[PDB]
Amino acid sequence: QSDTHIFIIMGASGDLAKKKIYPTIWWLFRDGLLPENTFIVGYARSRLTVADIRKQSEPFFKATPEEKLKLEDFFARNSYVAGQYDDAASYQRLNSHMNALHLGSQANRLFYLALPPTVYEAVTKNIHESCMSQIGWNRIIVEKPFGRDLQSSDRLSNHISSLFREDQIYRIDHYLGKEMVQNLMVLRFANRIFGPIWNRDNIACVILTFKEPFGTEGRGGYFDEFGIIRDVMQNHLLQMLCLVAMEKPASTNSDDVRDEKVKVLKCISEVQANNVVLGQYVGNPDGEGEATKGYLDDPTVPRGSTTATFAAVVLYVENERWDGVPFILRCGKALNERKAEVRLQFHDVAGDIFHQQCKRNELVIRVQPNEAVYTKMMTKKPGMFFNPEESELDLTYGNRYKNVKLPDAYERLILDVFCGSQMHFVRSDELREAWRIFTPLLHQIELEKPKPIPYIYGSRGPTEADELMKRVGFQYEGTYKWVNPH
Ligand SMILES: NC(=O)c1ccc[n+]([C@@H]2O[C@H](COP(=O)([O-])OP(=O)(O)OC[C@H]3O[C@@H](n4cnc5c(N)ncnc54)[C@H](OP(=O)(O)O)[C@@H]3O)[C@@H](O)[C@H]2O)c1
Numbered sequence: 001q002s003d004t005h006i007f008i009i010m011g012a013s014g015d016l017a018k019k020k021i022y023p024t025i026w027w028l029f030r031d032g033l034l035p036e037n038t039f040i041v042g043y044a045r046s047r048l049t050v051a052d053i054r055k056q057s058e059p060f061f062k063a064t065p066e067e068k069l070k071l072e073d074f075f076a077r078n079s080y081v082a083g084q085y086d087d088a089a090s091y092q093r094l095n096s097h098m099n100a101l102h103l104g105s106q107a108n109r110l111f112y113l114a115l116p117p118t119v120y121e122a123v124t125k126n127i128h129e130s131c132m133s134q135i136g137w138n139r140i141i142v143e144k145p146f147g148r149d150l151q152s153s154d155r156l157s158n159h160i161s162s163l164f165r166e167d168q169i170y171r172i173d174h175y176l177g178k179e180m181v182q183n184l185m186v187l188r189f190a191n192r193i194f195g196p197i198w199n200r201d202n203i204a205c206v207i208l209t210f211k212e213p214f215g216t217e218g219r220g221g222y223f224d225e226f227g228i229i230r231d232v233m234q235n236h237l238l239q240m241l242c243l244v245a246m247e248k249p250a251s252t253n254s255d256d257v258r259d260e261k262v263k264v265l266k267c268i269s270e271v272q273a274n275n276v277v278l279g280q281y282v283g284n285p286d287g288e289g290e291a292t293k294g295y296l297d298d299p300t301v302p303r304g305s306t307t308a309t310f311a312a313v314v315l316y317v318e319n320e321r322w323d324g325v326p327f328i329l330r331c332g333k334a335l336n337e338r339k340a341e342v343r344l345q346f347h348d349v350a351g352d353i354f355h356q357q358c359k360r361n362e363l364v365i366r367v368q369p370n371e372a373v374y375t376k377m378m379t380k381k382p383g384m385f386f387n388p389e390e391s392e393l394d395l396t397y398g399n400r401y402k403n404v405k406l407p408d409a410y411e412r413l414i415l416d417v418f419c420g421s422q423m424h425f426v427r428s429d430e431l432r433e434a435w436r437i438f439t440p441l442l443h444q445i446e447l448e449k450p451k452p453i454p455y456i457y458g459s460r461g462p463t464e465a466d467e468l469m470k471r472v473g474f475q476y477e478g479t480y481k482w483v484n485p486h
Helices: 015-030 050-060 065-076 088-099 117-130 150-163 179-189 220-224 227-245 254-265 409-419 428-448 463-472
Strands: 005-010 038-044 078-082 108-113 138-142 169-171 203-211 276-282 310-316 326-332 339-346 362-368 372-380 388-396 453-456
Touching (some): 005 088, 015 050, 038 088, 050 065, 050 078, 065 078, 078 088, 108 117, 108 409, 117 138, 117 150, 150 428, 179 227, 179 372, 203 227, 203 463, 220 227, 227 254, 227 310, 227 428, 254 428, 276 463, 310 463, 326 463
Parallel strands (some): 005 038, 005 108, 138 169, 203 326, 276 453
Antiparallel strands (some): 203 339, 276 310, 310 326, 339 362, 362 372, 372 388
């Protein structure tokens, strides 16, 4: 478009703006992906100049010498307004500043809230009252947390919705910006090989996994307030569940997609303790550096905290496609690897003619690291043998698409806000369902304070988690052997 566009970084002085938002909007700018007439306005409490923003942020830009002119033009299009987050006069100054930009009263305005949630309500109120374009569109970009339970999320939502239409609100769940998460829809709905088997007649279980190999890294006191279910399970994992489970949408229009996601969540009952395993990591005495330290060995964590650093939970989608199929959500810190993954395990073939030698087929979508899709399946054992053995059909992006840069999630998502595409942003009704599913459990945990099961730093987590997975119908043999073909 030829319209002026203004990108307002609310909280421009903070760490997140410095290390992530300023570098992302630079990358989009550098790559020629933004509108020609774009300006960037920082707003925060400190009395900073553009030269200070540049000094703090440009080390994270990965700028090259050849980009020097583009960089000069980028900083020429930047400005900074000092102000407080609930001061009417400050927002007035911000509005006037924006009006003074080239066609500024006409401009489309995008507000990125690079702020803590304790100022969300004051910032949204003030933007609405003072800084909205009367001609351009107005879009607000908000990051987690969105409440900490159903009642607290409803309060924020009801505040924002009283001021902003759903088509002005862009709630980030950054998994929705990742390459292979966005692929889930194409894989499922562009292919006949995945279509007729994607149902309860063929699928024994679905496993949605998020593992990190580091602990809390001295920042445990922050984590301790919310825990792993609020951090990862209620948002990122549940989003992956929705994209795995959803019926095929009427179109790829933003709200046809998000309608199908909500429809999935509305069929999920509130999870109970029965289907939950919680863990907390302890130090590995045979380990090195951080790995010798448990969760309670972080001095910012409250003494005797029972906060879980690991959760496995089983949900069920109560509908025709999914009736009975367990969806296992599993996540933890200080585990054996970094990995996020979707895995479908297929049922056994009926009418076995291979004398119980066959294993269940599996489809794996590995989100990170090392983006890949593969199907574990049976082939005749190569050479002079007749017995089936497990093998796979593989697609690895690092080998197949060596030269192709995959954008960071924040690159993709910020660009989507410019384009007005809400497909990959969390809708108000979707948010509410997510909290409805998990709030009873979260409240029970806060009330009864169950003691999480210790697991050692660097392990796969508590063995009770594997037991839960087996109980609900996941089969593990440990016979599959993969050799990296390179
Ligand atoms: N293109 C590629 O890069 C590619 C393609 C094919 C295979 N491979 C590699 O080959 C290796 C094996 O592949 P895979 O992980 O798909 O198959 P797998 O080793 O058969 O593992 C299947 C699943 O079982 C889980 N598990 C492990 N022990 C368990 C237990 N005792 N009880 C219950 N569940 C258990 C694993 O958990 P975890 O998630 O905790 O391990 C994994 O989720 C992996 O390293 C994989 O990365 C790579």
